[PDB]
Ligand binder design. Structure first.
Ligand SMILES: O=C(O)c1ccc(-c2nn(C(=O)c3c(Cl)cccc3C(F)(F)F)c3ccc(Cl)cc23)c(OCc2ccc(Cl)cc2)c1
Ligand SMILES: O=C(O)c1ccc(-c2nn(C(=O)c3c(Cl)cccc3C(F)(F)F)c3ccc(Cl)cc23)c(OCc2ccc(Cl)cc2)c1
Lengths: 255, 269
């Protein structure tokens, strides 16, 4: 791998990233900074008017928001799955291995890209047409409030790295091509592709962030953390499932 | 209107997802049904003794939970168990259809509620020939004659599935064709109670365009196969109506039958 191949890979992934996801970090940041104001949900009354205003496809209030998070996450899985097919070499892997990589990767990627939509005060929703405040989400009763706040806690730290969309496109691909997912049949071509993506990410960060020392290592430290965050997350889901309890078809969609 | 390249890309995406979503392809089923090999041969159940031997040899033929029960019920619960698994597989497939998960959540449920039976019949035909049906992921083959001879209302409950399959199979569709066909069925804007008919019809229009092109390229010598296949998607509507009528009648008489909650909810209204 020469620098030319690595820059070509970075640009290929960037181009696909822009086409795959509805709201880029660049567009999200302009909305969060104030550079039409989004509709703000900050309490129960503004939530009621906002689902009238924005027609959330995404009934006690805390559950309604929780189920809105689930609807959006399912959409993100399909967006990530389509993005994965643009990663060079991915569609040539064993079909079972494509499925395994996506199954075990989507949660880490959803957390990562959710950070593009958050600041310390709230989160963009409905392709940036809405903004739900952190204080509102944190204040939800039962375990739902403590279910929402860890997402903000991660995003504030992840966003301190100041990654842009061209960095994130490669980073997300690196996550997908993880050779240690349980049950992979042919680890060799997965790690070979991840080695190319890691080389491209290293060069991208040195060129795009020349003054950010060891940003490559700090970002790998983060992709690491994501493993533990996601495991905390699935555990919190199992606690809710036994405590709160949906049409059987709906259970299948969200399984 | 989308371009030929986009339509071919959609066909390939759906075929890929279909291979990933469904455990036993028509291609694999036909390789088993044709034989000529040693490693793939199924064990054939055609009577009581071979059913007994098959539960010893073979993915349980019939659920072990029903082992104390009369044979017709045991076989029925084997069908329902697999149908429930099919609902789960179809739901997974549906999520891969571009645009499906972006629909109103109520409409997603409604499309699946009304679509799964038609798809199950369609895909069951892949596992059938005129003499029987592959079971246990193709490890077994149960004969049409054995199923038809089941007592009470069960024998005549089984036979219409074969009657449809022989006619559907004469179209000689392959998995790449079926993957688009099944997506067309799911995205039907005429299902009762849909809230947002327009975005569903928009997706089906692209799927129909893709199916039309797929059949012209894959079956260039089969005149008006597209129209013949739409004529089939029609019949399924009445075939499924006969099925649900028979099932509700049988359920009232056979206290030993159980419906999985997933199926139970689908059959309500
Ligand atoms: O646009 C997007 O890219 C996007 C992506 C992720 C989330 C989101 N997921 N999520 C999870 O818990 C979750 C996660 Cl991280 C990973 C896998 C599965 C889950 C699951 F399934 F459990 F849901 C959240 C929890 C809290 C918050 Cl603030 C947000 C989310 C998101 O939420 C917008 C939203 C919020 C409220 C309402 Cl009413 C409507 C939309 C948007
Ligand atoms: O592999 C698969 O994709 C597959 C898919 C569908 C069926 C199957 N469903 N079915 C229905 O009546 C039924 C239908 Cl169509 C739709 C919804 C609900 C029902 C319900 F609940 F009423 F059962 C059948 C009746 C007769 C026959 Cl021959 C087959 C089936 C299937 O049966 C394999 C089998 C046969 C015998 C034994 Cl012992 C074990 C397995 C396989």
């Amino acid at each position: 791998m020469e620098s030319a191949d690595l820059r070509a890979l970075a640009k290929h992934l960037y181009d696909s990233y822009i086409k795959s996801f509805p709201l880029t970090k660049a567009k999200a940041r302009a909305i969060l900074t104030g550079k039409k104001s989004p509709f703000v949900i900050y309490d129960m009354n503004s939530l009621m008017m906002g689902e009238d205003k924005i027609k959330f496809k995404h009934k006690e209030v805390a559950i309604r928001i929780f189920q809105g998070c689930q609807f959006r996450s399912v959409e993100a899985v399909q967006e990530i799955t389509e993005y994965a097919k643009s990663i060079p070499g991915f569609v040539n892997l064993d079909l079972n291995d494509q499925v395994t990589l996506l199954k075990y990767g989507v949660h880490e990627i959803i957390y990562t890209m959710l950070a593009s939509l958050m600041n310390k005060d709230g989160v963009l929703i409905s392709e940036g047409q809405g903004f739900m405040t952190r204080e509102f989400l944190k204040s939800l009763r039962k375990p739902f409030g403590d279910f929402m706040e860890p997402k903000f806690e991660f995003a504030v730290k992840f966003n301190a790295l100041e990654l842009d969309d061209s960095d994130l496109a490669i980073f997300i691909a690196v996550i997908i091509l993880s050779g240690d997912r349980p049950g992979l049949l042919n680890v060799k071509p997965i790690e070979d592709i991840q080695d190319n993506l890691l080389q491209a990410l290293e060069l991208q960060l040195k060129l795009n962030h020349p003054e950010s020392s060891q940003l490559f290592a700090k970002l790998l430290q983060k992709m690491t953390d994501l493993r533990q965050i996601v495991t905390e997350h699935v555990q919190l889901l199992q606690v809710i499932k036994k405590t709160e309890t949906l049409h059987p078809l709906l259970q299948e969609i969200y399984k």
